[PDB]
Amino acid sequence: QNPSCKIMTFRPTMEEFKDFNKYVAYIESQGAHRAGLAKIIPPKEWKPRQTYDDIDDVVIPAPIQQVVTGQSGLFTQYNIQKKAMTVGEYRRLANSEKYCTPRHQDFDDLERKYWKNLTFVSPIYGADISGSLYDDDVAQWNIGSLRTILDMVERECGTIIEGVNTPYLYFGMWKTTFAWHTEDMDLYSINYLHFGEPKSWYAIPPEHGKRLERLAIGFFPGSSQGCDAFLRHKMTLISPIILKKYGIPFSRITQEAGEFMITFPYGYHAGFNHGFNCAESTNFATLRWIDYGKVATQCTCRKDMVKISMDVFVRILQPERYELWKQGK
C-alpha cells in the first residue's frame, strides 16, 4: 500500500468523515500507518466549537518552563513547573519580545531557527491541561468521546488516566517542544489544532522504530543503563541533521489550525509549536493495537508511569490466544 512510508494527508467528505472508527480503518487500508503519522483535514462544514471568544479566562494550572541542554543536535529537555496563569496572561507572554516567533522567510528558515536557538531562552508550555474545547453539540471526531476499545480500561477498574483516557489541552508558544516518544503503551493518539500558529511534527516509521531506539542508546549510554525505556521519560531531542547523519528514515509535516493528526502504534514522533496556539489530544485504540500493547516497553525507574493491564483486551478480544498468552507463549 504505502511502501515508501510517506506521511499521507486525507481530505474526507462529510459522509466519509462521519464515523471516526471506520475512518481509521480506511486510512490504514491505504497504508497511512506505515509512516507512524497521518494528517486528516476535516470537511469545511465541520466545527468542534462555535467560538473561541472566552478562552483568555481558562486557567493553566501548571505551565512548564522547558529547559533544553546539549549541543550538536542532541539535547535533553527538562520541564520545570511554574505558577498557574491564565491563557490571557500566557498569550501575552507568548507574544512578548523574549518569547515571540522569530522573523523568518519560510518553514526551512523557521526550522533552522528552532534548532539553532533551542538552548537559549526556555519557552513556557501550557501543556497537559485536563479539558476539552469541544461544544457538547458535536457528535463526530469528538476527542472527549471517540468510543474505541480503549474505553474498556476504565470500565474494568474505574481508573481514569488523565490525557490517555481523557482529553488534554496544550496552549503553545514559539519553540515549545514535544520530545521523541511513542505513546504510553504504544497507543494511537489523535491531535486537533483548535487555533493559532502551526505545530510541526517529525515522525519515524514504526518499522524503523527499533533503529531509533538503538541510536538513542548509542547517544546516551548512561540513560539506557538507568532505564530500559528511557525515551519514555520524554526528554530526548534529536535534530533532523542527526537523524540523517545516522540514516534514520523520517518525514516531517506541519499541522495548521483546524487539522487533525493521528499517530499510530509505535510511531515515534517529536516536534514544536511555531507560536501561540491551542491543541487538543487524547489516546485511542483499535484491535490492531492490542499486539503492540502486549509487548510495549515500560519505564522501570519511575513510579509515576502509565501502565495498562492487557489482560482484559486479550481475554475478550483475543480469546483464542488468551490461555497461551497467560503462560509466556
Binding site: I64, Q66, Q77, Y78, N79, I80, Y125, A127, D128, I161, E162, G163, V164, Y168, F178, A179, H181, D184, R232, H233, K234, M235, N283, D304, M305, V306, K307
Partner: peptide, 8 residues
C-alpha cells in the same frame, strides 16, 4: 499516573 510532557 497520568500522561505528561515528561522532562521530570
Amino acid at each position: 499516573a497520568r500522561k505528561s510532557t515528561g522532562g521530570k
